[PDB]
Amino acid sequence: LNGGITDMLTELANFEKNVSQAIHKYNAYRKAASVIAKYPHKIKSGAEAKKLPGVGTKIAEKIDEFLATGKLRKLEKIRQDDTSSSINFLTRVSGIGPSAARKFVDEGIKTLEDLRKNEDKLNHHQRIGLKYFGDFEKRIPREEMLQMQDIVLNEVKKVDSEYIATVCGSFRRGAESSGDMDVLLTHPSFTSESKLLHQVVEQLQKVHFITDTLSKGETKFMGVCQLPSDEKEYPHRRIDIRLIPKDQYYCGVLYFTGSDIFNKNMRAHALEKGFTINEYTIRPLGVTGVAGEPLPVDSEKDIFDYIQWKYREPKDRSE
DNA sequence: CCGACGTCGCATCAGC
DNA sequence: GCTGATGCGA
DNA sequence: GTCGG
Ligand code: NA
Ligand code: NA
């Protein structure tokens, strides 16, 4: 319908992020892309698009140029620019953001092949990102996620049957595929006013599910895992595990379940009901707008009750 | 006209 | 060596 | 780049 347009805008979004380092222009173009990607008509003019929220004068102008000419002179030009296309490309490596990508390209390091010849200039994160560059850009089919989940919950329970672990993200909402695995972990002994993560990562490495570590501290692990394999080996996958204190666990599960759009509406509703919800806690707003103490939460539902909404199933939380 | 555009954990850098 | 800033990803 | 106080 409007794929020419959404791809044009997504493309522009990446050059702002990765090349111009203008994070707010990346989000402007991304949000324009989203609003158009959902508009149920073939767009005829920039003025038509302009009516949608997220589309201003400058994107209206660019849509007019695309509609009339079938391209955008500025994109054509930036696309063919050696420096910029290279910088934009390198940022597809996990661990290389806009600033490292610039630095590499400044010194002549432009390609994956170049990165491979210069391992010594790569931090640990970036080396892992390069090693699995292709695997990381693959989606994970639900079936595989179900098998990953089988392993995580088994090994977690076996370290201590009192841990609670929940796989969140779009998988928890029922998506047919996923980009990574986001595990939320708590234990009754860990509260806000209270090695729990390390023992779980350790057991997942002992059975060779976790193959690599990007980062790991007392509350957050980010790394790489692989299902056990005649068959061709499974792709390596991104898994994060976070340890959240129990009295904030369900605020965390609700947040990390999303979608983004749902959480936004839920936060809207709560405000009008005189509550403030974030990732950690729900709190009452006083008459002048002063937030008081976090309220006890023991299930997701508790949160919905506080703001007089009806428990919605992960499956029904796209908006 | 002009500021907001989430916020934070970890790894690593820059300054002292 | 210590502390706070930065880059990055989420 | 877009919105909005
Ligand atoms: Na508009
Ligand atoms: Na990157």
* Structural shape: globular
Number of helices: 16
Instruction: State the domain count.
Output: 4
Overall CATH architecture of the largest domain: 2-Layer Sandwich
Based on secondary structure, the structural category is alpha+beta
Supply the CATH class of the largest domain. Answer: Alpha Beta
Strand line-up of the largest beta sheet: 2-4-7-6-5
Tell me what you see in this structure.
The PDB classes it as transferase/dna. The entry lists the keywords promutagenic 8-halogenated G insertion, polymerase -DNA complex, base excision repair, TRANSFERASE-DNA complex. The assembly is tetrameric. The entry is titled "Structure of human DNA polymerase beta complexed with 8-BrG as the template base in a 1-nucleotide gapped DNA". The chain has helices at 3-20, 23-37, 46-50, 57-69, 73-79, 82-90, 98-106, 112-116, 124-131, 133-136, 142-159, 169-172, 196-206, 249-257, 260-272, 300-306; strands spanning 140-141, 164-167, 177-178, 181-186, 210-216, 220-225, 237-243, 275-277, 282-284. It is of the alpha+beta class. The protein has 4 domains: 2-81, DNA polymerase, domain 1 (Orthogonal Bundle), CATH 1.10.150; 82-138, Orthogonal Bundle (DNA polymerase, domain 1), CATH 1.10.150.20; 139-255, 2-Layer Sandwich (Beta Polymerase, domain 2), CATH 3.30.460.10; 256-318, Beta Polymerase, domain 3, CATH 3.30.210.10. A 5-stranded mixed β-sheet has the order 2-4-7-6-5, sandwiched between helices. Helix 1 packs across helix 6 (82-90), helix 6 (82-90) crosses helix 7 and helix 11 crosses helix 13. The longest helix is centred in the N-terminal third of the chain and has 18 residues, at 3-20. The radius of gyration is 23 Å and the shape is globular. Residues 50, 52-53, 55-56 line the site of one sodium ion. It binds 3 DNA strands through helix 2, helix 4, helix 7 and strand 5.
